[PDB]
Amino acid sequence: TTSSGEGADVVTTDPSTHGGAVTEKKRVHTDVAFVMDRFTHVLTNRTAFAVDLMDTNEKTLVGALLRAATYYFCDLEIACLGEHERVWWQPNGAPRTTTLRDNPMVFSHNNVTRFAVPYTAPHRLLSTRYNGECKYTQKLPSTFNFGYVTADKPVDVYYRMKRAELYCPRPLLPGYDHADRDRFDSPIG
């Protein structure tokens, strides 16, 4: 199916060119809103922390796909774990304080603390990367966060993107290295 490639026109040919029919599939697990909606693990044994969403491990599904997008929009759901009495949450732009009162707060129930954080940042969109005079011939600003959680005792933390909307795609890379063998070859249960 010859065509000029310089124009970068999209081309997608099915095996129909060789006489084989292929019906369109309605993929659902590839969908952004479905994939991004999970409790990715982010950090362990930490009391106070900013709820920056770039703390996600880059090898995890949610973190990698999140870095596959330049801009993003998400309601969030936090889920702390481990022994603690309570969890405070300061909305974005609230001044930091070592003590907390009257700020929104959730007691744990059976050493688990799940709650929904509304999108809070002033920017109409957040971004996973930000060109702030980082020109090169070869870090994201603090306003990009959903809040500032503090726990009574150090806790494991989970984030769950909601109503996710990813904008402007960026490259994904496989995490595995092939070593000596060109085919990676991995065990399967």
């Binding site: 109409r124 795609p169 890379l173």
Partner: protein
């Protein structure tokens, strides 16, 4: 395949055009926002071509060699005045790239626009086609013509400082000159103009 693009009084004919490549949107379309309280005003004169050399392109340069060009770049024109007079500002770029060469040359460029890049990892280059892009094959076109809307977390990018778009040109294949005509070097220019500029918040004149 003649194509003639004018902005302002400036024009740019090209006879090797392969066609415009719209990125992310069929057309830039500004809408008024809360954040400027309506004080923003469009300026006709900013929308003009200005051009700059990128690099000589020899056969010496291998695969994956990059040439980024941060945008907006400093410039002597009216557009370079507006960064000084007005703080907040908005624009959507329209870019040509030209690498004139004998068609007996062999090689290829991947010109592409990357929104907000801080760095580009060595593995990452192969994926660069995800961005809006065109190829420059000397056997075919010598001209690429990407066109993109304003992008950013803020509706009005701060004057100077943050750069939303960067024009990267990668050497997708090494140059070859089997004819040995030399030739040799192949200069690569860019011909760039702003579109739909808007400015807000004028600030006191220097000094």
């Amino acid at each position: 395949r003649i194509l003639t693009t004018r902005h302002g009084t400036t024009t740019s004919t090209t006879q090797s055009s392969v066609g415009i490549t719209y990125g992310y949107a069929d057309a830039d379309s500004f809408r008024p926002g809360p954040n400027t309280s309506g004080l923003e005003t469009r300026v006709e004169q900013a929308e003009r071509f200005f051009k700059e050399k990128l690099f000589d392109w020899t056969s010496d340069k291998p695969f994956g060699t990059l040439y980024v060009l941060e945008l907006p770049k400093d410039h002597k024109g009216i557009y370079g005045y507006l960064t000084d007079a007005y703080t907040y500002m908005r624009n959507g770029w329209d870019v040509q790239v030209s690498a004139t060469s004998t068609q007996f040359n062999g090689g290829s460029l991947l010109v592409a626009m990357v929104p907000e890049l801080c760095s580009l990892k060595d593995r990452e280059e192969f994926q660069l086609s995800l961005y809006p892009h065109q190829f420059i094959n000397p056997r075919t076109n010598t001209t690429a013509h990407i066109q993109v809307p304003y992008l950013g977390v803020n509706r009005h990018d701060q004057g100077k400082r943050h750069q939303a778009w960067s024009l990267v040109v990668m050497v997708l294949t090494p140059l070859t000159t089997e004819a040995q005509m030399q030739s040799g070097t192949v200069e690569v220019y860019a011909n760039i103009a702003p579109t739909n500029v808007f400015v807000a918040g004028e600030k006191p004149a220097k000094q």
